[PDB]
Amino acid sequence: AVLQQVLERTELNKLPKSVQNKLEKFLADQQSEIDGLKGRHEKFKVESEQQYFEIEKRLSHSQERLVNETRECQSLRLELEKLNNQLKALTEKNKELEIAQDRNIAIQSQFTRTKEELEAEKRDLIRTNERLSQELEYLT
Amino acid sequence: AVLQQVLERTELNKLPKSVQNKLEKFLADQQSEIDGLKGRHEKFKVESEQQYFEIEKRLSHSQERLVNETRECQSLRLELEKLNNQLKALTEKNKELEIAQDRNIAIQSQFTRTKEELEAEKRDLIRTNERLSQELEYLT
Amino acid sequence: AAVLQQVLERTELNKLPKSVQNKLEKFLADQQSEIDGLKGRHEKFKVESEQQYFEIEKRLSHSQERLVNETRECQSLRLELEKLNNQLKALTEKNKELEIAQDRNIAIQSQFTRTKEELEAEKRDLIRTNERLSQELEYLT
Amino acid sequence: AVLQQVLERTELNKLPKSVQNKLEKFLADQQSEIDGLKGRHEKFKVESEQQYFEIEKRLSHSQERLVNETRECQSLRLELEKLNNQLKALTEKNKELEIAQDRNIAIQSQFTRTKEELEAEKRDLIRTNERLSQELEYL
Questions:
Q1: For chain B, is the Cβ count within 10 Å smaller at the N or the C terminus?
Q2: Domain count, chain B
Q3: For residue A43, what is the nearest residue in chain B, using CA coordinates?
Q4: What is the domain range of residue C141?
Q5: Which residues of C touch D118 (CB under 8 A)?
Q6: Could you say which DSSP state residue A139 is in?
Q7: Contact B94, A89 (CB under 8 A)
Q8: Chain C: residue nearest D3 by CA?
Q9: Which chains are within 8 Å of B by 3+ CB pairs?
């Protein structure tokens, strides 16, 4: 009872029932509103802080992902620098090997022609030996 | 007056002035406390509303930033994969050339033997050639 | 037979059938001409091949120079590009913080508008009440 | 050997043994010198061609690398001026935002003064209100 919270029981009692009850309800309505506002405020406070925390959680989380991704990019740039050096070294090495192969092809061609030269001379000597032998086979 | 809103003008007159003042004061205080809470809640509401809008905006900025940084890593990751394929291609091409060099050395050594064999045969033919010729000269 | 005379005596030469003399003379003269021809061709080739080698090595060196230069500028440009890009990122973040501030300012100016209007209302209520008190006091006095 | 190629088998017979020997030796010696030169020349020729071909390949390789490197580099100079211009653009944009912020902070300082004035005026009304209350109830 709110009016009991306002007036002394003696002075309260000397009031008409119409007066007492009207006072009681209006005063209780004001008191009800006060508790209504405090409750609504504390309700909002907790819920607003809660929702804020959740979004604060996400931001701090993504920022961690951002710093991670940033490091990865730097790491990739390091690998790119390494691979680029490895391609250049391999490209030069392979071009030297292609030239070495070209020299070998030339050498094997040179030997092939040389072989045919000797094969011709061998045939000529056997032929020349044959004629000299053919003449001497006749005499005995 | 606030009490004039609660009670009728006739029955209000019937109250001791001391009682009216006690009631009037209590009502005004309650009314002040009500309005005081409303100001507190509305101030807190507006400020929390801005702070929430702000952190949402920060998360959006972070999210936008994270996606872009990923786009920058992805282009690096793509070029890296391209380089790796080229590296493997040169590596296999390299091995083919190293093998080709090892093959040629074996071949050129075999060629040298053939050259030596042919020249040996030629030397013997020339000896037989001179041998047959010398006796021919002696005869005629 | 000018060349054949250097091989044979004039007596042995004269007793040869003329067809034989002429065949031998031509073959022998061709041999002499070929020998001088090969020596001349070889030394000529040597000079010309060295020149051709000199010229192509010069072109190679020019191409090598051009590549090394382009490679250096390209690498140098790649670095500056990364630097400017990083400077853009930092400048963008700095600008986004101010953009957030811009919204904060909009909200604050909104809040002051309400506060001023609220205060004006309370002032109106007080002025209203003072008028009520003054008139009641004016009537009683 | 060499004389057999120069003369026909028939006309060769009319030649004395001494003459054949003088001729065959002379012919063989010169032909020997000739063939030796052809061998010397061909070896030098082949070797020089291979060495030249090598430099052709090095130049060809160098040229291809240059053309490819140039094609990737060409875009960069344009991008730098574009990025540099964008940097200058944001810098001006930055200053405008900084200016707008400094302006607003100053404005918000005026807001605070106005509110205090309003709060002051309100208090004086409450003060006059209390005076009217004191005079009304007592008198």
A1: C
A2: 1
A3: B41
A4: 1-141
A5: 116, 119-120, 123
A6: T
A7: no
A8: C24
A9: A, C
